[PDB]
């Protein structure tokens, strides 16, 4: 219900790549989807621009904390995905790029 613009519950890894790389999206475009690798957790997919490869999509595991919370690196955890998204929109803080706009469809 009423997903955030960045939340694509059931979108696969490959369809996330497909849509992020399509027209209307650009560097920093991103989404969060259920993980296809770790049942019960989420994956972050973000478009980046590499000197060598050109446009690419990179994926990060979002780890769950027992009894609530999320992280990408243990160095910093969050009580929710809103806080995680805000943090990595404000600073890359180790990611390949800052989160910019949710995937446009």
């Amino acid at each position: 219900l009423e997903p955030e613009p960045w939340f694509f519950k059931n979108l696969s890894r490959k369809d996330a790549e497909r849509q992020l790389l399509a027209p209307g999206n650009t560097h920093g475009s991103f989404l969060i989807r259920e993980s296809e690798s770790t049942a019960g957790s989420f994956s972050l997919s973000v478009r980046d621009f590499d000197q060598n490869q050109g446009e690419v999509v990179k994926h990060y595991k979002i780890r769950n904390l027992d009894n609530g919370g999320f992280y990408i690196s243990p160095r910093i955890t969050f009580p929710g995905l809103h806080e995680l998204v805000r943090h990595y929109t404000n600073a890359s803080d180790g990611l390949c790029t800052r989160l910019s706009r949710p995937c446009q469809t």
Partner: peptide, 4 residues
């Protein structure tokens, strides 16, 4: 997957 990428890592930080």
């Amino acid at each position: 997957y990428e890592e930080i």
